[PDB]
Design a protein around this ligand. Structure first.
Ligand SMILES: Nc1nc2c(ncn2[C@@H]2O[C@H](COP(=O)(O)OP(=O)(O)OP(=O)(O)O)[C@@H](O)[C@H]2O)c(=O)[nH]1
Ligand SMILES: Nc1nc2c(ncn2[C@@H]2O[C@H](COP(=O)(O)OP(=O)(O)OP(=O)(O)O)[C@@H](O)[C@H]2O)c(=O)[nH]1
Ligand SMILES: [Mg+2]
Ligand SMILES: [Mg+2]
Lengths: 366, 366
């Protein structure tokens, strides 16, 4: 059995970070998102993964996906295309899917969860998609705006965008399983599985919902990125090698106030405070008395002594000043450098910039 | 004789347009900037041009520079590198320059002028650089911040940044001519010609200034892009095939208020008003009653009927609404689509966005 991961898309909401690498390859915790999904699929037993590459065709996806050497998994990489929407890549890859009898998985590269994939053995009871429209309970379904009306029969009546009445709380979770006959329904053109194929499947009564018991988060926005990190790190602390601690003696003496993820190659200064649900990338350097409250530090980033970055993301090769505060939901680009004493309250800095001025209001640094 | 054009750099000031293509390849009027410079160099008699390619090593610069088939000129493309500053590429290309007796040109991909290149035959009077630090008279030298003190002996005393006293009005013009011995001075590392090599040359007394009689503009910024286009189009109106008109009967019946540049393949509405110093790209479609006041329309961009874009730049594959107003200095990305009735007053929109809200103040749309 094989899977198909939608690895295209421009990453508009995660723009300051996706101007350098595609959205699937943006490191979540200490690994790319697609790597988490591929690890889950391999744990299931899927050996073949089909990547629908539109953004950065060969510059980034093919080169950086050397993980095929690891993980004992192989990627087809034969869905190179122009932008064909969410559903078009399946129409393009109908040939490589071979239209075999065995169903196939479909995933978005932006969803994080416990990945309960027992929907393979389960939900085979006469479904066009074996519980394909997997749904998660969110109390904020107004702003999410994609509500799935799943009854006890699991037959999807309709899809409602921003419904006024309390039709339901379940929302789409971005994980699907399809019988290959769906390849006949999808036309060879730009289309959206969410707004074209799925309403038709719901009308025909071949669309079935799957309830998600565990946590779920679509980490495709910086705020959702931070909150998904908070939800996810506690699950992964015992999974990996990264008292109230996860990595408490990596460099000198520093304090951890809960779950975190510090790479073995990262250097942490003396008296630093790596706070709860914080990620430190490889080869990263952290100053003496830094405070990484809820921040993600990516790759070869350097943070000076006394800096406090909280609920914020910093790019791959930053050089943060000494006594800075990067607060709120602030995202830094690939090679941003911040001078000492600069305060960034939820400001997004584009790659290859130098910041030397305080910004106390949310905004964008060109 | 051979030239070296510094085609690297991240294009930070032209960021909304340089997130898709490198700064040299950003179309100025109806051609890339580097193409204007290469045409001037070919008019000189220069056959070899060496491009210092750092940004987009092979994705854009090598593929898009198919102009080598045209123009009767050849480019070396042997300076692929990591970011080495403004002076380092010369050290890297020392080997391909062969250290021959003949001098060589140096140019930036951000400058537009009449290109007086008679500085080859002139200024040979015992100069390390034959009038290498070419200077132009600008009354706004304070904000430009690079003032060159050129006396009647043309020996550069010093370089002053934001001078309080009126030392001089001449500023750097970005065109240089060096004897190959300078390759010994430049170290094989990241350096800047403007802030490392040039002060040393001025102190040594081997730096000579060349005055620029004609117009000049560093068009690396959208405001400077628009103003330099205004300065430049009157020079090029008679040069190319694009009463008080330049292209007055291309599509239907429309009015031209002055100099402009309308590509032969562009269809220009019916009753539209293509204003003074306006550029319309190839395959572009213009609505019935548009007002292209001082705007540049790039490539396959479509503009609806009644839209008024003034002193603004639209991207390559835009789809502008019908009754919009894109005023002030506004820059649109590669694939921005604007809904009908939207007003953008000097707002920079990143590529692959959809604009549906009025923005009456300068800002950035992520
Ligand atoms: N292959 C491919 N996948 C896509 C495309 N557009 C979206 N996707 C997938 O859809 C999921 C989420 O969409 P993204 O493109 O990441 O998010 P976005 O950039 O805000 O754009 P949309 O969600 O499409 O409005 C991700 O799995 C994407 O990989 C596309 O044009 N081609
Ligand atoms: N090869 C190369 N050329 C550069 C580099 N940086 C600047 N240049 C050249 O210097 C000129 C103007 O600089 P740009 O980089 O375009 O402008 P910018 O992006 O605002 O950055 P700076 O002017 O360098 O501060 C252009 O000719 C560039 O090609 C570089 O790192 N490598
Ligand atoms: Mg998403
Ligand atoms: Mg410039």
């Amino acid at each position: 059995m094989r899977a198909v991961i939608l690895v295209g898309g421009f990453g508009t909401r995660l723009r300051p970070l996706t101007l350098t690498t595609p959205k699937p390859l943006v490191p979540f915790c200490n690994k790319p998102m697609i790597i988490h999904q591929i690890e889950a699929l391999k744990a299931v037993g899927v050996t073949e993964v089909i990547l629908a590459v539109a953004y950065r065709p060969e510059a980034m996806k093919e080169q950086m996906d050397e993980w095929s050497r690891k993980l004992g998994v192989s990627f087809v990489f034969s869905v190179e295309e122009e932008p064909l929407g969410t559903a078009g890549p399946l129409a393009l890859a109908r040939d490589i899917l071979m239209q075999d009898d065995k169903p196939f998985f479909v995933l978005n590269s932006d969803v994080t969860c416990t990945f309960p994939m027992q929907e393979l053995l389960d939900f085979h009871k006469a479904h066009g998609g074996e519980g394909t429209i997997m749904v998660s309970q969110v109390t904020q379904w107004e702003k999410y705006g994609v509500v799935v009306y799943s009854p006890q029969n699991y037959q999807i009546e309709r899809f409602v965008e921003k419904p006024s009445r309390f039709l339901g709380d379940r929302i789409n979770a971005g994980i699907y399983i399809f019988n290959k006959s769906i390849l006949d329904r999808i036309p060879p053109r730009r289309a959206s599985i969410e707004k074209e194929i799925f309403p038709a499947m719901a009308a025909e009564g071949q669309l079935y919902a799957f309830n998600l018991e565990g946590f779920w988060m679509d980490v495709g926005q910086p705020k959702d990125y931070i909150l998904g990190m908070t939800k996810f790190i506690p699950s992964l602390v015992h999974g990996n090698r990264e008292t109230e601690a996860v990595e408490h003696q990596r460099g000198g003496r520093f304090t951890v106030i809960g779950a975190s993820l510090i790479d073995p190659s990262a250097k942490i200064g003396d008296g630093a405070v790596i706070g709860p649900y914080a990620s430190i990338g490889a080869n990263c350097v952290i100053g003496e008395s830094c405070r990484i409250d809820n921040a993600a530090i990516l790759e070869n980033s350097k943070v000076g002594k006394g800096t406090m970055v909280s609920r914020s993301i910093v790019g791959w090769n930053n050089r943060i000043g000494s006594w800075c505060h990067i607060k709120d939901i602030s995202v830094l680009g690939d090679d941003v450098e911040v001078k000492d004493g600069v305060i960034l309250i939820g400001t997004k800095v584009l790659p290859n910039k130098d910041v030397g001025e305080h910004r106390f209001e949310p905004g964008i640094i060109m």
